[PDB]
């Protein structure tokens, strides 16, 4: 189906010690493939996936030099945004930035994202048609005017449509063994009597990629949107994902309940019933 | 591949 490439940059100011801490990561779908940490001794852009190590020295040198330029821009942004909001020098503040692109089934351009945030709330974003900006508060209007007077949305649009998609197809073909795979969830369900009368039925979902899965609980066709608990999807540490959903029922009515799991790797959605 | 253009500040 679709695919995506995303880049996340975060910068935190330390008003008493050293330069601000900067961390940058890059994702293809749900696989992290590159990192950069300013506190690390290497001071280089480092790989995180087996298929990204084929790149030459010029690639790593360029990536390092440009992400360091990103960090300097974020430092100056912190300095200015402290001025716009009239805050003291002794606080600690954070700027966050995200940009990336999506491609469809035929590996054509579909959409692109560019967003800023200051202290966890939206500051300025690039609209879904990639032509005009969106600013939330009054302090962002000055930045909007400054960027709208220098055609910044089109320097970014030129990158988001062309070179992001070029790079994404490059990676998708370099790592076809792992990036285009798909794993079926290993589904099983367990029972636990609570004290004497009620019981918990919990249907699991283990070791599936990608991370998009859906779990539902039904009682003879009744959609149980309530009385059920499902936890956030959690990584397993090896590139797979786990989940589970549980429901409490009176004893003797276990056969009345069932769990449906649908994943992209399942040709037909499953249905689990006790024993 | 990070964005290869001209850096613009807030």
């Amino acid at each position, epitope marked *: 189906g679709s695919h995506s490439m995303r880049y996340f940059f975060t910068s935190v100011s330390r008003p008493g010690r050293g330069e601000p801490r900067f961390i940058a990561v890059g994702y293809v779908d749900d696989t992290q493939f590159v990192r950069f940490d300013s506190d690390a001794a290497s001071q280089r852009m480092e790989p995180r996936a087996p298929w990204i190590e084929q790149e030459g020295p*010029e690639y790593w040198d360029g990536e390092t030099r440009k992400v360091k330029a990103h960090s300097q821009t974020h430092r100056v942004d912190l300095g200015t945004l402290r001025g716009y909001y009239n805050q003291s020098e002794a606080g600690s503040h954070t700027v966050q930035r995200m940009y990336g692109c999506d491609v469809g089934s035929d590996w054509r351009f579909l959409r692109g994202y560019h967003q800023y945030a200051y202290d966890g709330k939206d500051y300025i974003a690039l609209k879904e048609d990639l032509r005009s900006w969106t600013a939330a508060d009054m302090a962002a209007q000055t930045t909007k005017h400054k960027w709208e007077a220098a*055609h910044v949305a*089109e*320097q970014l649009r030129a990158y988001l449509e062309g*070179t992001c998609v070029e790079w994404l197809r490059r990676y998708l073909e370099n790592g076809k063994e792992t990036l285009q795979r798909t794993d079926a969830p290993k589904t099983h369900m367990t029972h636990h009597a609570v004290s004497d009368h009620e019981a918990t039925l919990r249907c699991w979902a283990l070791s599936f990629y990608p991370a998009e899965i859906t779990l539902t609980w039904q009682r003879d066709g009744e959609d149980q949107t309530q009385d059920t608990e499902l936890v956030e999807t959690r990584p397993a540490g090896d590139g797979t994902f786990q989940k589970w959903a549980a429901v409490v029922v009176p004893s003797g009515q276990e056969q009345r309940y069932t769990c449906h799991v649908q994943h992209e790797g399942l040709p037909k959605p499953l249905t689990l019933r006790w024993e | 591949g990070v964005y290869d253009g001209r850096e613009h500040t807030v």
Partner: antibody
Amino acid sequence: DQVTQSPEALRLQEGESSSLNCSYTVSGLRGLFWYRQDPGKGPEFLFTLYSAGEEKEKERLKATLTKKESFLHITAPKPEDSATYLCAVQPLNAGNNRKLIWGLGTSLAVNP
Amino acid sequence: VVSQHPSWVICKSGTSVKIECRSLDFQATTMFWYRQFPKQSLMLMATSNEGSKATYEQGVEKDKFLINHASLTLSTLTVTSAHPEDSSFYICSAREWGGTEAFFGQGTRLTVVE
């Protein structure tokens, strides 16, 4: 691969208004650059048009970009707007290690 | 601003010529060396990227012209065995980041006589 700039030579009267244009066909266009060159010096950078649709404007020159071609409008030329006007295009590449494509030029001569 | 040096060269046929392309106002990532014979259009000679080895063109004959991208702000073209057919107008351009425009410095008139 295909960037043709016409007319190959121009001749204007001081105070007229003319327009050059540069036609290109690529699967690409990371950018489009307009330069100007004197007979015995290095080219002088004039414009960059990253996407199709927008239009820049310097003191007297004006540039536009569309899906098929780009135009350079000159309004009320003076006899010192005499040079060679060059058009370049940078096609897309994952790494940008692909050389530009240069138009041949256009000799502009302004008579008083 | 990109500036070359020297701006005028004359030499006996048989010696080597060295031209420099100091880049100012930024740290250039890519440096291009062009060439222009009189009354004809620009022809690209070679390209040097980051700190790797230069990539030459079809009619440039590597053993003649040498490029040494030593620093991030200094390229150095060297014509090894000058010949009177190598009397042309050499220009050099530089760009930072693969997405921005390049800048040209002032050319360099070379004339070789035997």
